[PDB]
């Protein structure tokens, strides 16, 4: 049976950091649900791309649990994720059940807001490091993708393919990741 | 005054190849119109991401001309672009006025269908090379981004940042491209 991913899409999300993981995970045969934080309605991303989610978050939660919960970046998307009680509970439950949490760019700052994964080695976008490191609850990394157990983090739009393929490897293994990678024409 | 880009979005487009150029061009201060081939309605991309276009193609044509016309890839998106009389006329007019045409992955095969840019050096996705080369109307390149005058081509999802930054350089210059590139965390 296939693995399943929940991608939580909020206003102001970085659209590249949303679409690249969704697309790459679907290429890997992962069943992905793009869930709208606010509801079922289209979401205006950071650079004004408008994406229609598959479901509301409320409804997508009904259908969990998921093998990975993915939080895109973008500041403002991350801020919306960080303010959400629904996201708090999803992340807490995912941590409790020992499931993977993957987030990119400013997205890891939602982990901070919701007290998830403290003590982990993490990376973020360079511009999000100070926010992530407030209180010293994580150890910082400049690796393009960082994984400390069940906390997978990455840095920015330009690390999104690497991030997505790291999720694929974690869920479906190295061989599947390599097979998905080749047709992408990555360097 | 700002440069302007038309991105033509058809069913089956590769969503990464759509969003990465839109986002990067907007970061460069280019005024981008995401125009739906079929109309105003949301578009189901190749990996099922649903994107709401800014306008129909019909309406976007009213507001041209544009400094660049961008065609995403995806086979099936490219096939829809290749079958469209509206796209034929937009590309012919853009070629006549000596404006840039930029396309990626299978997207260059729409140039073939509409008899655009014959004699140019081009690249495509490897899987689209045979279709592009039918009749020997172009000279093939394995460069990740190829530019022969006003015909700019590129290979796949994993060359989309390079492709987008090549458009930015062509329209807004090298310095702007470098400034846009740095926050992306590209390798």
Curated annotation (Swiss-Prot), chains A, B:
The record marks 148-149 as: Cleavage. One of its GO terms (molecular function) is oxygen sensor activity. Sumoylated on Lys-129 by PIAS2 or PIAS4; which is enhanced after ultraviolet irradiation and essential for cell-growth promoting activity and transforming activity. Cys-105 is easily oxidized to sulfinic acid. Its EC number is 3.1.2.-, 3.5.1.-, 3.5.1.124. Changing residue 45 to S: No effect on mitochondrial translocation neither on deglycase activity. It comes from the Eukaryota. Changing residue 17 to N: Strongly decreases enzymatic activity. Pfam families: DJ-1_PfpI (PF01965). Changing residue 52 to A: Strongly reduces chaperone activity and ability to eliminate hydrogen peroxide. There is a cross-link at residue 129 (Glycyl lysine isopeptide (Lys-Gly) (interchain with G-Cter in SUMO)). It is found in: Cell membrane; Cytoplasm; Nucleus; Membrane raft. Its main location: membrane. The modification N-acetylalanine is found at residue 1. The modification N6-acetyllysine is found at residue 147. Deglycase activity does not require glutathione as a cofactor, however, glycated glutathione constitutes a PARK7 substrate. It is a lipid-anchor. A lipid is attached at residues 45, 52, 105 (S-palmitoyl cysteine). The keyword Isomerase does not apply. Induction: By hydrogen peroxide and UV irradiation. In pancreatic islets, expression increases under hyperglycemic conditions. Expression is also induced by sulforaphane, an isothiocyanate obtained from cruciferous vegetables. The modification Phosphotyrosine is found at residue 66. The modification N6-succinyllysine is found at residue 181. PANTHER family: PARKINSON DISEASE PROTEIN 7 HOMOLOG (PTHR48094:SF12), PROTEIN/NUCLEIC ACID DEGLYCASE DJ-1-RELATED (PTHR48094). Homodimer. Binds EFCAB6/DJBP and PIAS2. Part of a ternary complex containing PARK7, EFCAB6/DJBP and AR. Interacts (via N-terminus) with OTUD7B. Interacts with BBS1, HIPK1, CLCF1 and MTERF. Forms a complex with PINK1 and PRKN. Interacts (via C-terminus) with NCF1; the interaction is enhanced by LPS and modulates NCF1 phosphorylation and membrane translocation. Interacts with NENF. Belongs to the peptidase C56 family. It is linked to Parkinson disease 7: A neurodegenerative disorder characterized by resting tremor, postural tremor, bradykinesia, muscular rigidity, anxiety and psychotic episodes. PARK7 has onset before 40 years, slow progression and initial good response to levodopa. Some patients may show traits reminiscent of amyotrophic lateral sclerosis-parkinsonism/dementia complex (Guam disease). This is Parkinson disease protein 7. It comes from Homo sapiens.
